Every structure is written in C-alpha cells, then in structure tokens.
Amino acid sequence: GMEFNHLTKQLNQLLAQDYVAFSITENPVVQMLSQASFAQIAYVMQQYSIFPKELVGFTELARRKALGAGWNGVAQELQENIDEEMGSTTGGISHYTLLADGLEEGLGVAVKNTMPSVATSKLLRTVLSLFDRQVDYVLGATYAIEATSIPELTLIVKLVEWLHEGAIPKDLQYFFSKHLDEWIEHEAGLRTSVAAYIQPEEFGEFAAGFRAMIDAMQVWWQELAQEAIS
C-alpha cells in the first residue's frame, strides 16, 4: 500500500542516485571498455552468466522463507517467477539456456562450462548468507534483484553491442525484447504481494536486506573489472 510504496520508492531512488555499478555510463566495466580486448569482455559475460544460472535457486530459498512466515501471496508470486525463469512462457526453455545459447551461437562466447572467479564466488557466498536471515530482510534482498533487473539488462546490451560491432544477433534480440518490455508487471506483482503482509516495524529489515544486496552486487562489478581488465 501507500506506506510500502513510499519505502520502495526511496530504495529505488537510492539505487538510481548512489550506485555507479548500475549506471550505463559509470559502471566500472563500461568505464574500462576502451582498454579491453574481446577476450577480456567475453570473460566478463561468462562470469556474469553465473548469476542468471543460480537465480532460480535463490528465488526458491526466498519462496521457502515466505512459506515459513505464512506470506502465502508472496510464495505464490515467487513461484510464478520461478516458472517463467524455467520456461513457462517459452515452451520449457529456461531464460539461462536462452541467454547461454544466444551468446554462444550469436557471439562465439561459450558460458555453460564457466567456473566462478574469486569475485563471483564472493558474491555467491554473500548472497547465500543474506538468504539465511528473516523473511523481511530476505524479501528486501529479493526486491533488489527485481529493482536492478532493467539496469543490469541495459548494461548487458551495451556489452553485447561492443562484442558484436554495434548489432544484436537474432536470438539475443528476442531475449532482450521480451524482458525490457513490461517487466513493471514483475516489479508490481512482488511489491503488492509483500505489501499484503509486511508491517511498518519491519521496514528497517527490508531496507537493510535491499542495501546488502546492491552493495554485494556493486562490489562484484568493481572486482570483476579489476580481474578482467587490470
């Protein structure tokens, strides 16, 4: 409702004003593109790909936290999200598979065998540590994944355009088009489902969860730029 909408608005504003990692111009990989080779940015794409690969698993941990608190509307919204991610709207082909195949066949960049870097392993450990707090904190971290989706996606488009002479191969174009579309519908669904259960005295924990996730994510882009380019 109105109070939760007020909090979520402030959190998005914080993301948009204070975090260079999600800026299309101030992202630390983007800032070093002039100094990078094809292979170094391919390494970036490969490491990036591990987060979509592991996203269904994290969303399932959040769904189990929701169920455990009796936040049933939220466990249902998350399940519909898990179902999309695993391929309900695309005939049983996961979003990760659509991305992986799109990068390999479109760009010549293979990601399916990628092992996590030091940075990427650090992000994974941190995220799994967050998902072991209480439901309000964990849903704030889950809401951050949603709020960063469009900024993240915009970044990946630029990296794909840089790796492929400014153009977008057909399958990656499908993938970007279906996401950067409405999904708004995704954000609203999670926001309104959580507003049905969350109390004002739990807004602090929700905001701390959110902050922890965008911190971890920004640190990852920063460390990845340092691994990859210098």
Side-chain angles (χ1 to χ4, degrees), residues 1-8 10-133 135-152 154-164 166-179 181-182 184 186-230:
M2 183 192 206
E3 298 148 297
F4 193 54
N5 282 1
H6 191 246
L7 179 74
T8 60
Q10 290 171 297
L11 296 171
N12 283 294
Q13 280 174 335
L14 168 71
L15 167 53
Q17 295 164 14
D18 288 356
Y19 285 74
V20 291
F22 308 106
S23 167
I24 195 51
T25 56
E26 301 162 75
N27 175 272
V29 169
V30 168
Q31 279 178 334
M32 289 303 108
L33 277 181
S34 69
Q35 306 294 300
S37 66
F38 186 94
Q40 290 169 336
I41 300 310
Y43 170 97
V44 169
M45 285 307 305
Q46 283 164 350
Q47 288 303 308
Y48 168 77
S49 80
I50 291 180
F51 202 71
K53 187 167 88 147
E54 303 291 327
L55 180 51
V56 155
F58 292 129
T59 310
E60 178 65 20
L61 293 162
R63 193 185 75 90
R64 295 197 206 197
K65 282 284 173 171
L67 289 171
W71 291 20
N72 294 326
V74 179
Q76 180 70 66
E77 189 63 22
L78 291 172
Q79 188 63 254
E80 296 167 14
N81 296 357
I82 291 172
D83 288 345
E84 284 167 31
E85 289 155 11
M86 271 163 143
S88 69
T89 52
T90 64
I93 317 297
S94 69
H95 289 7
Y96 171 79
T97 300
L98 297 179
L99 179 71
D101 285 358
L103 292 171
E104 188 157 0
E105 300 175 66
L107 297 185
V109 173
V111 309
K112 284 172 194 182
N113 291 317
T114 302
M115 286 168 142
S117 72
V118 178
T120 299
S121 286
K122 181 162 150 187
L123 181 61
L124 292 167
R125 292 198 308 274
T126 306
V127 170
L128 202 33
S129 79
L130 301 184
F131 277 64
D132 207 38
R133 297 282 295 262
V135 67
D136 42 7
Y137 185 100
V138 170
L139 265 288
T142 301
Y143 185 66
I145 297 179
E146 199 65 60
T148 54
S149 298
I150 287 180
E152 183 175 292
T154 313
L155 290 161
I156 297 313
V157 179
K158 194 180 170 58
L159 294 192
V160 165
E161 290 174 337
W162 187 89
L163 287 166
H164 197 243
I168 314 209
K170 196 186 176 173
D171 272 21
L172 282 179
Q173 177 69 255
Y174 184 79
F175 183 76
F176 296 144
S177 284
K178 297 296 127 180
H179 277 242
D181 188 71
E182 203 201 16
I184 272 231
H186 249 234
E187 184 275 344
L190 195 64
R191 182 160 45 71
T192 60
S193 69
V194 171
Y197 303 94
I198 198 174
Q199 303 305 302
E201 62 269 30
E202 304 166 325
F203 286 0
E205 291 286 310
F206 183 98
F210 188 95
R211 174 80 79 170
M213 182 61 65
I214 66 168
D215 283 351
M217 282 176 140
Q218 170 148 294
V219 164
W220 176 87
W221 279 104
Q222 288 174 326
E223 291 178 351
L224 193 58
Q226 176 71 22
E227 285 174 357
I229 303 149
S230 259

